[PDB]
Tab-separated table of C-alpha atoms in Angstrom:
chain	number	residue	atom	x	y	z
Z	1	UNK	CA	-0.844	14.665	8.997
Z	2	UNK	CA	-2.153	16.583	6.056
Z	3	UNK	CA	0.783	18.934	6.468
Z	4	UNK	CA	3.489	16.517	5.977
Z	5	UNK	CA	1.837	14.269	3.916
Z	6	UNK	CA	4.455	12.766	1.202
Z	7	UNK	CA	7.518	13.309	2.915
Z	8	UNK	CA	8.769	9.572	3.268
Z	9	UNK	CA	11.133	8.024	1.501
Z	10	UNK	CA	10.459	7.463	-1.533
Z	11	UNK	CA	12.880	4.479	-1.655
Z	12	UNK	CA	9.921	2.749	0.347
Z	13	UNK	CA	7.807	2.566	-2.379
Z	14	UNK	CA	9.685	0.103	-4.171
Z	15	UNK	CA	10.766	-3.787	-3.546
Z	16	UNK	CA	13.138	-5.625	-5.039
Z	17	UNK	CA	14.092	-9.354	-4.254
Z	18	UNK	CA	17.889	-8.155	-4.723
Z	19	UNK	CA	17.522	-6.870	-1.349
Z	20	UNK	CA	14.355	-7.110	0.409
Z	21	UNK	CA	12.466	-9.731	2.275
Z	22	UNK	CA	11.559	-12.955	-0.217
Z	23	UNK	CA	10.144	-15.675	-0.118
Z	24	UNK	CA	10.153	-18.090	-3.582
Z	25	UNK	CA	9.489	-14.839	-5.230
Z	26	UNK	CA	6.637	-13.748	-2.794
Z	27	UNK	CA	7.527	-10.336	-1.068
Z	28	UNK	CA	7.136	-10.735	3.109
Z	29	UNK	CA	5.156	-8.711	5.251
Z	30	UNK	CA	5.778	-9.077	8.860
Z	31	UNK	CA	7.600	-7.799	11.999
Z	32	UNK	CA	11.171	-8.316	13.735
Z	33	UNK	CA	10.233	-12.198	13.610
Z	34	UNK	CA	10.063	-12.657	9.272
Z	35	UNK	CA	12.653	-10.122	9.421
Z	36	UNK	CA	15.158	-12.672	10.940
Z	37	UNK	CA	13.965	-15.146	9.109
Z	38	UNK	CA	14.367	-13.268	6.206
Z	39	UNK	CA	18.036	-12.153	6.961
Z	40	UNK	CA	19.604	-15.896	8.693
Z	41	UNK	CA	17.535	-18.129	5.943
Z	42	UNK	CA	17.022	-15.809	2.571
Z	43	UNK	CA	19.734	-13.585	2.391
Z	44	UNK	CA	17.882	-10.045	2.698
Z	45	UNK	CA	19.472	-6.694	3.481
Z	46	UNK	CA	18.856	-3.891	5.555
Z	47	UNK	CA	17.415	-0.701	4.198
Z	48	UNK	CA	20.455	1.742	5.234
Z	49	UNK	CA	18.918	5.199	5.192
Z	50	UNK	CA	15.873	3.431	8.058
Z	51	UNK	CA	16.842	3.998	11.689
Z	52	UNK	CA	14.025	1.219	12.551
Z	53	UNK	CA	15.201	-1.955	11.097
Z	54	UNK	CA	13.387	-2.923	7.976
Z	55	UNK	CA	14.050	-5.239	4.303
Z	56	UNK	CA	11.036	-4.697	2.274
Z	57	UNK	CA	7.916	-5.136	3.812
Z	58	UNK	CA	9.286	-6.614	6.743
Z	59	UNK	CA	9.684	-4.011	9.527
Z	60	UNK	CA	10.730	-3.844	13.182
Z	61	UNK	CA	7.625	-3.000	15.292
Z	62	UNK	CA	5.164	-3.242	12.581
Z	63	UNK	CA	1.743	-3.851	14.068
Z	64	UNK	CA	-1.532	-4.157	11.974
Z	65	UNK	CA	-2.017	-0.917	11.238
Z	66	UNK	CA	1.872	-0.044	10.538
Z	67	UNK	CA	1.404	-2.531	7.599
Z	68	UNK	CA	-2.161	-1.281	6.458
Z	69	UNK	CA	0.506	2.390	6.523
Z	70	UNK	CA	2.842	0.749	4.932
Z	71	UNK	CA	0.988	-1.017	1.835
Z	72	UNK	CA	-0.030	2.676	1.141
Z	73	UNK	CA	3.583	3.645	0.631
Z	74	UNK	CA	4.352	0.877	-1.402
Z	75	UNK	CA	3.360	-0.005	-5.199
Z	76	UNK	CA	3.839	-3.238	-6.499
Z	77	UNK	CA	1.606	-5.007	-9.826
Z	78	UNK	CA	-2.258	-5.961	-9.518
Z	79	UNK	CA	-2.444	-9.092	-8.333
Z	80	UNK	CA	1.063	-9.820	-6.097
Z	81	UNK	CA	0.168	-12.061	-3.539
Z	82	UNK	CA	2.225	-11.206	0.028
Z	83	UNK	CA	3.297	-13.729	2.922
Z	84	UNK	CA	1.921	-12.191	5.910
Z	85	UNK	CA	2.293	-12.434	9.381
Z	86	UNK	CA	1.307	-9.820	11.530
Z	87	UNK	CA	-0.217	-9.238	15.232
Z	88	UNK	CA	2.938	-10.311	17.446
Z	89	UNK	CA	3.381	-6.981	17.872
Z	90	UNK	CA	0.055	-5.927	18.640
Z	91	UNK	CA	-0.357	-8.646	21.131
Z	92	UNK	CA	3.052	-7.938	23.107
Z	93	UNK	CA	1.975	-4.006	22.994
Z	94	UNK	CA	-1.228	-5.080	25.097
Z	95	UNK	CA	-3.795	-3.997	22.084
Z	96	UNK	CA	-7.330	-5.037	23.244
Z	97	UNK	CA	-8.139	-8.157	21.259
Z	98	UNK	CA	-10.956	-6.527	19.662
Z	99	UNK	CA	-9.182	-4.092	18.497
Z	100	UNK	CA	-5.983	-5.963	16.935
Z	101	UNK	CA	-8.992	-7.987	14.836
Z	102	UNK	CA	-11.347	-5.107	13.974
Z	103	UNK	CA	-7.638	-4.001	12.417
Z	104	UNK	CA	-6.788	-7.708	10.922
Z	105	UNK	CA	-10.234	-7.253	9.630
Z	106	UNK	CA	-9.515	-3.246	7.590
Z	107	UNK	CA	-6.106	-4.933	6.801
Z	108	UNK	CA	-7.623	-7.507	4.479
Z	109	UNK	CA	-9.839	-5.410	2.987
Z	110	UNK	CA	-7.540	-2.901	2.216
Z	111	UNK	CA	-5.587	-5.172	0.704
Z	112	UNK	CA	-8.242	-6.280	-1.767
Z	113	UNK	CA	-9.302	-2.635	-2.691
Z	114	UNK	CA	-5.479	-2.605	-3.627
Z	115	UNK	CA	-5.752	-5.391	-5.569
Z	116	UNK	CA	-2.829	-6.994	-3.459
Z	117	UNK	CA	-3.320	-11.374	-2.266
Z	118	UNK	CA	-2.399	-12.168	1.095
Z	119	UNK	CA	-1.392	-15.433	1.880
Z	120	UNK	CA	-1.491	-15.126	6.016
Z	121	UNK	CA	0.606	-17.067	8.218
Z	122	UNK	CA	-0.703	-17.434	12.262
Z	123	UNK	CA	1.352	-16.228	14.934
Z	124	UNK	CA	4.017	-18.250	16.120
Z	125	UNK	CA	3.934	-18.311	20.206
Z	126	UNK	CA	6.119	-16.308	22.360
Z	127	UNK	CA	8.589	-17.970	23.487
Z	128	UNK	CA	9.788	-15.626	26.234
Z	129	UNK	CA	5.829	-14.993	27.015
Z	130	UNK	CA	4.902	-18.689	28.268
Z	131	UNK	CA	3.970	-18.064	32.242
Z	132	UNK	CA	1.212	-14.822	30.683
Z	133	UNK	CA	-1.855	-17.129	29.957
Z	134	UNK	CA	-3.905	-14.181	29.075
Z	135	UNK	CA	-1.106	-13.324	26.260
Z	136	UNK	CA	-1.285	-17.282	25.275
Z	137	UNK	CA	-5.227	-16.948	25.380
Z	138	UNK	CA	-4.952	-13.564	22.926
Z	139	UNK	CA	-2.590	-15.285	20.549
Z	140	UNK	CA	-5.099	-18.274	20.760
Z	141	UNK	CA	-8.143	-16.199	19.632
Z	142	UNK	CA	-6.390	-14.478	17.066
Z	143	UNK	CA	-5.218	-17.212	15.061
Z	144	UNK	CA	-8.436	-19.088	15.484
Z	145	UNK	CA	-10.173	-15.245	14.146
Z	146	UNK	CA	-7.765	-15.062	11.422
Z	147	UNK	CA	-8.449	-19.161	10.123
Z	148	UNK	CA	-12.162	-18.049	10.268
Z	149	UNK	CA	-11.502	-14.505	8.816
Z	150	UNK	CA	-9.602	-15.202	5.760
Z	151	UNK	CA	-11.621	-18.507	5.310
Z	152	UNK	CA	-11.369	-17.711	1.405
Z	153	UNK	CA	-7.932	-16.961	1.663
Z	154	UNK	CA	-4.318	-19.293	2.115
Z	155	UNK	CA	-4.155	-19.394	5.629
Z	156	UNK	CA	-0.397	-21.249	7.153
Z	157	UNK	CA	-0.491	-22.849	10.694
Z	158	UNK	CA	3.483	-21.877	11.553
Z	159	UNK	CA	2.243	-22.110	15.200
Z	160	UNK	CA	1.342	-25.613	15.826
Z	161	UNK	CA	5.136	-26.485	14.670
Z	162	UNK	CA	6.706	-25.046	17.701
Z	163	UNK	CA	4.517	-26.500	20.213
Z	164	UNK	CA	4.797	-30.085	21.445
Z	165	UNK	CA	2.645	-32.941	21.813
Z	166	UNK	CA	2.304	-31.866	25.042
Z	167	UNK	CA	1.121	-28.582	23.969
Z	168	UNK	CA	4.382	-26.941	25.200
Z	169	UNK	CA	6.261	-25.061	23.527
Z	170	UNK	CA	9.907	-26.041	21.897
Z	171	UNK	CA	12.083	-24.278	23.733
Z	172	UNK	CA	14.644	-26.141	21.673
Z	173	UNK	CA	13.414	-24.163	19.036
Z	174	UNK	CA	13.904	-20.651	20.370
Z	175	UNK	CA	17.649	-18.726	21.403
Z	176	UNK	CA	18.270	-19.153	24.955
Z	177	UNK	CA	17.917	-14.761	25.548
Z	178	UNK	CA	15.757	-12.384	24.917
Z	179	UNK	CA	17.215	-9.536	22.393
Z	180	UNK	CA	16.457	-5.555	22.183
Z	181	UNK	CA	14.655	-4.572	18.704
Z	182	UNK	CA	14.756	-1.100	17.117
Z	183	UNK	CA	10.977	-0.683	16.865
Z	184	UNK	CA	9.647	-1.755	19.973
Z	185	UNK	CA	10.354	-1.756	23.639
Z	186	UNK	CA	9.528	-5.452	24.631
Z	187	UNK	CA	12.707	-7.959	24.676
Z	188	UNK	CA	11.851	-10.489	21.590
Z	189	UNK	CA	13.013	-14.156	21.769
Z	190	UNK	CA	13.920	-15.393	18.257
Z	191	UNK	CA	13.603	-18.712	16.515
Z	192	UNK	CA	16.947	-20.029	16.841
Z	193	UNK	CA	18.255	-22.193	13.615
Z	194	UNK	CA	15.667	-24.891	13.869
Z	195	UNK	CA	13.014	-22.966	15.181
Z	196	UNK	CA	13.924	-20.975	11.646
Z	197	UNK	CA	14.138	-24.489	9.419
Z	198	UNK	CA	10.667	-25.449	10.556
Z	199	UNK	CA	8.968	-22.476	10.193
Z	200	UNK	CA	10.756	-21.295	6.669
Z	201	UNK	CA	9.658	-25.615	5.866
Z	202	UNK	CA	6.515	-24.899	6.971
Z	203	UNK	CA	5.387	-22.260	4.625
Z	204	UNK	CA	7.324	-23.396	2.121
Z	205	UNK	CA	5.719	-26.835	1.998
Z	206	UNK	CA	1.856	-24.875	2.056
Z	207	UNK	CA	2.987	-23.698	-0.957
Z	208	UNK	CA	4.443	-26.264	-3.468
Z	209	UNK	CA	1.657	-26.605	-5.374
């Protein structure tokens, strides 16, 4: 509120690659998913004094609007371009679709009146999540809203890598159990390490040149 306005941390409104979530000098944005990716595959820490888990912009239980939050509690130069991805959250909370792109949609243009690039990365699919078909249809939509959406903008398929030809997805590529997060109550099945490799390869490979 208005009353407590400015009482954060102020160690939150600066990133450093030392410590927080990078990519090849990019600064990530995302939930518990780029947060693991972040700590197995690029060597980020923890913030200590944050009882959620967070490195950087990557933060446990951030949905679309906890990043549009967060971006105002941040500073970084004019012009830093940031790896998104963003919605898993959303989507496993049960936020009407509507509503999780009407807030994709205030995301990105906050972002420009910030004078901050995203490059967006879809949503990987939920590996634990495979028998809801109306949580497969949402995750659908969304990517196909956010590849029409951000039509000017980088846009990274990380999804199609972890489905097969079958269109099933590579449960070779995801840990055998479901883990508790900090910042949300729904049980989260990670990449495991080549669900990581492709994903991290990927993005990286979108952006060589």
């Amino acid at each position: 509120t208005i009353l407590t306005s400015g009482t954060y941390n102020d160690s939150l409104l600066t990133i450093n690659s030392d410590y927080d979530a990078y990519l090849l000098d990019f600064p990530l944005m995302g939930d518990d998913f780029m947060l693991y990716l972040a700590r197995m595959e690029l060597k980020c820490r923890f913030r200590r004094h944050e009882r959620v888990l967070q490195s950087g912009l990557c933060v446990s239980g951030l949905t679309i609007n906890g990043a549009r939050n967060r971006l105002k509690r941040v500073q970084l130069p004019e012009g830093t371009q940031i790896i998104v991805n963003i919605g898993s959250v959303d989507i496993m909370r049960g936020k009407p679709l509507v509503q999780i792109e009407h807030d994709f949609r205030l995301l990105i243009k906050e972002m420009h009146n910030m004078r901050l690039v995203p490059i967006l990365t879809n949503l990987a699919p939920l590996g634990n999540y495979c028998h809801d078909k109306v949580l497969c249809d949402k995750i659908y939509r969304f990517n196909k809203f956010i590849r029409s959406e951000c039509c000017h903008l980088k846009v990274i398929d990380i999804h199609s890598c972890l489905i097969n030809e079958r269109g099933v997805v590579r449960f070779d590529c995801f840990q055998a159990s479901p883990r508790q997060v900090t910042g949300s109550k729904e049980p989260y099945l990670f990449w495991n390490k080549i669900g990581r490799q492709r994903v991290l390869q990927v993005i990286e490979t979108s952006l060589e040149y």
